Amino acid sequence: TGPMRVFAIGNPILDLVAEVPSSFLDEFFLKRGDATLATPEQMRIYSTLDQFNPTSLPGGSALNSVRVVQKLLRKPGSAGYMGAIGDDPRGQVLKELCDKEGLATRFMVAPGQSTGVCAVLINEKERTLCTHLGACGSFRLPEDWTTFASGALIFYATAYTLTATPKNALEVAGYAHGIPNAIFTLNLSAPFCVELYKDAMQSLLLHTNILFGNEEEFAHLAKVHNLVAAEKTALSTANKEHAVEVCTGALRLLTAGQNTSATKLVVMTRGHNPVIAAEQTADGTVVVHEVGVPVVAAEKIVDTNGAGDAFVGGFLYALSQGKTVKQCIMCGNACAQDVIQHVGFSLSFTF
Numbered sequence: 001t002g003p004m005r006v007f008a009i010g011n012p013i014l015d016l017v018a019e020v021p022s023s024f025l026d027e028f029f030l031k032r033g034d035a036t037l038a039t040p041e042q043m044r045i046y047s048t049l050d051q052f053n054p055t056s057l058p059g060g061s062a063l064n065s066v067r068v069v070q071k072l073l074r075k076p077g078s079a080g081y082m083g084a085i086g087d088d089p090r091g092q093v094l095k096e097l098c099d100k101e102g103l104a105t106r107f108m109v110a111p112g113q114s115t116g117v118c119a120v121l122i123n124e125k126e127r128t129l130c131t132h133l134g135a136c137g138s139f140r141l142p143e144d145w146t147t148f149a150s151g152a153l154i155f156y157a158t159a160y161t162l163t164a165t166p167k168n169a170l171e172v173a174g175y176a177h178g179i180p181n182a183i184f185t186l187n188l189s190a191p192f193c194v195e196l197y198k199d200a201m202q203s204l205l206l207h208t209n210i211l212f213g214n215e216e217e218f219a220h221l222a223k224v225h226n227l228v229a230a231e232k233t234a235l236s237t238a239n240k241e242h243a244v245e246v247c248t249g250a251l252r253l254l255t256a257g258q259n260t261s262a263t264k265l266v267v268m269t270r271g272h273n274p275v276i277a278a279e280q281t282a283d284g285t286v287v288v289h290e291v292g293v294p295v296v297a298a299e300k301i302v303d304t305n306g307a308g309d310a311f312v313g314g315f316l317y318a319l320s321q322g323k324t325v326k327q328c329i330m331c332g333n334a335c336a337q338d339v340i341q342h343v344g345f346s347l348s349f350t351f
Ligand SMILES: CN(C)c1ncnc2c1ncn2[C@@H]1O[C@H](CO)[C@@H](O)[C@H]1O
Pocket: 011, 013, 014, 015, 037, 058, 059, 060, 061, 062, 064, 118, 129, 131, 133, 160, 163, 305, 306, 307, 309, 345
């Protein structure tokens, strides 16, 4: 019942979270603390996980981010989402978890395929993630998606959606492009997305209003698109000056040297270090933002998985409220810091 403020596409994934012994990692040839896609030899990891009584929680990067938006906006249908699920029990579990939070969803069913699943394996204070996309790969944006999304001016896709087809994110960005107050936003998602989808992502960036990413994603973006000279490509983004150059070079992938009234903004999260952003303002001049990250002691950080997803959700919530760039970054920081200080990738009940 709306009004819908944010619309996103994603890979809808059920997260199965469990504490496992080290022999479980070893049996399945997992490297502790990595996040991978399930290999053939890892086929039975999800069924085998049942002996460790896992918890079932909604996951998927973009779904995490819009669930943050919906939690903060509170009214049912404040955020909308589409993706593909299987015609299996897991898909029903995920759908019902999303419905109970009031999110507006349309999940396309792929007969015969299994709903996306991610094993979140806890072991010696580290998370090890193993994801099987299944039905997520079948997603094809329906012809009436703009009607489902009616009223939303903020659109979001993760570069992870390119693994089904880049056409979904290109269609969503294509609708927003050239509309001064339609904002298409994109997450770089992972280093591999930057290389694997280089030319589709170059086109997509020309249609993008806000680009989010972390340091390693942007390092890969700078290398693949020659954004900085060879001599700078291995420089640390923990260095402010380097981070600023990378963001400023990435901004040209969004603006193509043009200046309109549309939003054109690149945001680099930097872990504990200040968020850095480069913005093309109304008259074409580029402004650089630096927003300090409140200190959180090592002892209080449970896990940083999901921090970026929550950052983006907080940023888009604040953007829907007409807040400034710096306020949107501060909201993203607040959401991310909540999530890293407890188990789970959702905002706390009391947030
Ligand atoms: C395409 N891949 C690898 C993925 N596509 C979308 N979401 C993913 C993902 N691999 C892991 N996830 C989700 O990442 C969240 C933590 O940031 C987890 O909820 C997990 O489901």
